[PDB]
Ligand binder design. Structure first.
Ligand SMILES: [Co+2]
Ligand SMILES: [Co+2]
Ligand SMILES: [Co+2]
Ligand SMILES: [Co+2]
Ligand code: NA
Ligand code: NA
Ligand code: NA
Ligand code: NA
Lengths: 329, 329
């Protein structure tokens, strides 16, 4: 009671977030793309309808909130978010920050200028909507580019001024979180304010416990990603990899068994439309995981329960950890 | 009489275009940027006001029409175009196509998919506005990337289906127009439908007459660009180069004197806001050329007249050539 988080429909009590998926998207796109070329997705109406059905399905499985980690450059459409949140009765936390596809107008900016843009989206509102970001999303794909270092310092500073958490995209195989952490700490950012994402893309538990031990949240946020059975498909194969969902899910238990239950955030990195990759990737995806954002509570949570993870532990991971993370601190 | 061109305010007779600047921008930005971060430009109201004052100044110097060659990825805001066109009483032709900053949602597309996007903007309307593009803008910066080859073939096909001309950004020093031409001709596109832009960035008249001789329009469209007196400024220096406006203007005469008066299009590549380069480049620019889009008729046209170019010739370059070019053919 007392603490609040911003969602696309206004403020909610922290305690009403409930079961929360911390890394999800309604639509993975590009800035301006959904406005310029809605037919790519059939129509905007078709997109919203598919998102509403998907989200009601997650709601029926026990999902109360998702964090849509779409930034500016993932083509975040906060009006679409508001519309489907409202229609499906699922809270949606919107993001600021920048992913790894920023245009020249962002790439030419300084750390001061980025900080001011992130603070705008958190404090003033996204665009002209008054809808406020509840999270800052950042990305590296390997060693940070010079511009990526600016983004990470500007994220740290935005967070320090507002108490809003930071969440990252990594190449997990390249152990990006270790540099991400060094950059954030050089800015005085508490590791409890930070989630290192796509961390289930690796089984390097030396890497993952090293981060957990320092206080970072470890985002095991790609649960249904697997190209097993589709090795013919080279694009599915590079995106989803060759590890099963059970292998990914085993990581949750491995971290719990090593004393890190409070450092884990679980999610799907699911979407309902997807323009920033090959055409029809969304059909491929929907065949791999027809349960969409219900896969975690239908499949992953019972799998953990059956392996002996206590229900209080599982509640801590899916409710307490998100609440503590999203709570402005 | 009879032929029409689309502008941001609806169709106009070809014959009312009059003195037309064929490569200009209201604002050089990025897709979504003006909506997400209007304060970068002071405000959107300040931006529109500066554009209206600039355009009325061009109107007073005899300018009746500009072609705003901002694409999707230059952050083209067709509503802003319509607003300032209307307020300044200057026609504005909007563009489709893609420049050299496309996001992943565009970079992952095929030639078929791009053709369908360009045709949408020409035939249906940009976004949800019903405002139709009158030109397709494409870009290389050296040898075409694989994606740039798709853009050029999709531009050629869009043009062939609609009769709308194509205009290009080149690195003139690298003689890009020669590959651009080969790609367009491989698609059956008539050279009379094509303008090779930034061609005044080079004094290689072998390169330029070679193109003119094949029927291309040669875009001498950077007239006021000069960093002379600002060699201290490394960003101004790389963008504007070390050649005077008189040197650039001499090219117009050189092509006329070689029998190519009908192949020349003249312009400034001016803007009223500019986010896709260093901060305050617009202040630097406005000090170099306080006349903005009036520089050509105030400075360039009298300079040519005083060097002995006949007024009928000069009218042919600034009125007849644009009309013939923009006229869907
Ligand atoms: Co990611
Ligand atoms: Co994601
Ligand atoms: Co250009
Ligand atoms: Co230009
Ligand atoms: Na994505
Ligand atoms: Na993804
Ligand atoms: Na530009
Ligand atoms: Na420019």
């Amino acid at each position: 009671t007392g603490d609040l988080i911003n969602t696309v429909r206004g403020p909610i009590p922290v305690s009403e977030a409930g079961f929360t998926l911390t890394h999800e998207h309604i639509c993975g796109s590009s800035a301006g793309f959904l406005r310029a070329w809605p037919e790519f997705f059939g129509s905007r109406k078709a997109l919203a309808e598919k998102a509403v059905r998907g989200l009601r399905h997650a709601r029926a499985a026990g999902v109360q909130t998702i964090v849509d980690v779409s930034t500016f450059d993932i083509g975040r459409d906060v009006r679409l978010l508001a519309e489907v949140s409202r229609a499906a009765d699922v809270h949606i936390v919107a993001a600021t920050g920048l992913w790894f596809d920023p245009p020249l107008s962002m790439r030419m900016r300084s750390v001061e200028e980025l900080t001011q843009f992130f603070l705008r989206e958190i404090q003033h509102g996204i665009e002209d909507t008054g809808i406020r970001a509840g999270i800052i999303k950042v990305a590296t794909t390997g060693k940070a580019t010079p511009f990526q270092e600016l983004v990470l310092k500007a994220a740290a500073r935005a967070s320090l001024a507002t108490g809003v958490p930071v969440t990252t995209h990594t190449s997990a195989s390249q152990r990006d979180g270790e540099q991400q952490a060094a950059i954030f700490e050089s800015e005085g950012l508490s590791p409890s304010r930070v989630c290192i994402g796509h961390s289930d893309d690796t089984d390097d538990l030396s890497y993952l416990t090293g981060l957990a031990a320092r206080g970072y949240l470890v985002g095991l946020d790609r649960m249904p990603y697997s190209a097993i059975g589709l090795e013919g498909n080279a694009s599915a194969l590079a995106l989803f990899g060759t590890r099963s969902w059970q292998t990914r899910a085993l990581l949750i238990k491995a971290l719990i068994d090593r004393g890190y239950k409070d450092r884990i955030l679980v999610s799907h990195d699911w979407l309902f439309g997807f323009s920033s990759y090959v055409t029809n990737i969304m059909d491929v995806m929907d065949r791999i995981n027809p349960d969409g954002m219900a896969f975690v509570p239908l499949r992953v949570i019972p799998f953990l329960r059956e392996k002996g993870v206590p229900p209080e532990t599982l509640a801590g991971v899916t409710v307490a950890n998100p609440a503590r993370f999203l709570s402005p601190t």
